Write a protein that binds this ligand. Structure first.
Ligand SMILES: Nc1nc2c(ncn2[C@@H]2O[C@H](COP(=O)(O)OP(=O)(O)OP(=O)(O)O)[C@@H](O)[C@H]2O)c(=O)[nH]1
Ligand SMILES: [Mg+2]
Ligand code: NA
Length: 342
């Protein structure tokens, strides 16, 4: 059960106050422009992006130059969430699905109200998280090197910029302490298991993103329960029901554990009772592309967890967002499963 063909990709949520740079960070990693396409420049839905470990290794190379950091995960599913205050339901849903998280804090503003909301969500579930202390390019006089590691860029800054960085860092540390979190600049953290690491980033220049990606792998590998590194019983959650061209009424699903297969008999909650149907198409986006954006879909015979998938199947009208989804196995009674899922 701990075999290479049984590794699980964990789930990381991004959380943070409105406009702190959650989507912009993911756009820099993906090399996409989702944020520019958003109405109002604000995220209004949960979005999912799968990052294969190959891509993570490449995007952390500048802080792993000798190639010796050991990557154990096969990849990571990252769930983007709204910061706008009206979407607390979606932050709660995203937080409930993740195994680890990134909390984005604008270094220029510190902790803000939806930061405090997000901290309550993280606290409640004992979720391991790192803080992306974002927007460092706004420190006055910041000199960038695109996609550099933070420490190498920080060493090239003038004294005023270094002073300003430390002043803002010390303020944010105090704010975290007021909320009951002891936090450390990531390379000053001597207790990774119990203290929150602060990793300075810019989504505009890419600086510090290599450090942030390395740290979330370290969260998976060193803080997340080790059992969650491997696949066990299926767990899946409906995010949305949506009509799309050619496929009809589909569901978007976060596959949290186990394996889904084309043709599977699935059961889930509907407005009038359980829905029982068969997967006609099991779809994902391309790697490093979003689920919440229309694009061309990849069809799979099999999808291993975690992933964001789109399922086409008859009868999904009235599927309920937040519903669990189960697969009828050989030893299952299809009617008995209907009752379990609700
Ligand atoms: N200068 C600078 N601007 C940034 C950075 N990150 C994000 N921004 C800007 O901040 C604004 C908000 O960015 P978003 O990516 O929408 O932030 P978000 O946290 O995803 O916002 P919501 O999802 O709406 O809560 C945009 O204008 C970004 O270009 C950064 O590192 N530096
Ligand atoms: Mg966003
Ligand atoms: Na925004």
């Amino acid at each position: 059960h701990m075999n290479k063909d049984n590794l699980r990709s964990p789930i990381c949520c991004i959380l943070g106050h409105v406009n702190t740079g959650k989507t912009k960070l993911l756009d820099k990693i993906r090399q996409t422009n989702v944020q520019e396409g958003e109405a109002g420049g604000i995220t209004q839905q949960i979005g999912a992006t799968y990052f294969p470990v190959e891509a993570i290794k490449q995007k952390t190379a500048v802080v792993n130059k000798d190639g010796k950091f050991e990557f154990k995960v096969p990849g990571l599913l990252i769930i983007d969430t709204p910061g706008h205050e009206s979407f607390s339901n979606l932050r709660s849903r995203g937080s409930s699905l993740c195994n680890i998280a990134i909390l984005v804090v604008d270094i220029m503003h510190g902790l803000e109200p939806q930061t405090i909301e997000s901290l309550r969500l993280l606290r409640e579930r004992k979720t391991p998280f790192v803080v992306a202390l974002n927007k460092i390019d706004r420190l006055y006089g910041w000199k960038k090197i695109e996609n550099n590691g933070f420490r190498e860029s920080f060493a090239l800054q003038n004294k005023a910029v270094q002073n300003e960085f430390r002043n803002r860092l010390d303020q944010v540390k105090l704010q975290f302490a007021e909320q009951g979190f002891n936090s450390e600049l990531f390379y000053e953290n001597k207790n990774f298991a119990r203290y929150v690491s602060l990793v300075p980033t810019s989504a505009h220049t890419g600086e510090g993103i290599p450090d942030m990606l390395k740290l979330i792998v370290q969260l998976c590998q060193e803080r997340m329960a080790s059992s969650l590194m491997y696949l066990s019983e299926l767990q899946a959650t409906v995010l949305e029901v949506k009509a799309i061209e050619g496929f009809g009424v589909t569901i978007d699903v976060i596959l949290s554990n186990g394996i889904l297969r084309e043709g599977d008999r699935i059961v889930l909650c509907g407005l009038e009772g359980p829905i029982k149907t068969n997967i006609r198409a099991l779809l994902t986006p391309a790697p490093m592309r979003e689920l919440r954006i229309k694009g061309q879909y990849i069809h799979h015979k099999e999808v291993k967890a975690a992933q964001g998938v789109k399922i086409s199947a008859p009868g999904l009208e009235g599927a309920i967002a937040g519903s669990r989804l189960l697969v009828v196995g050989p030893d299952d009674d299809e009617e008995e499963l209907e009752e379990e899922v609700e």
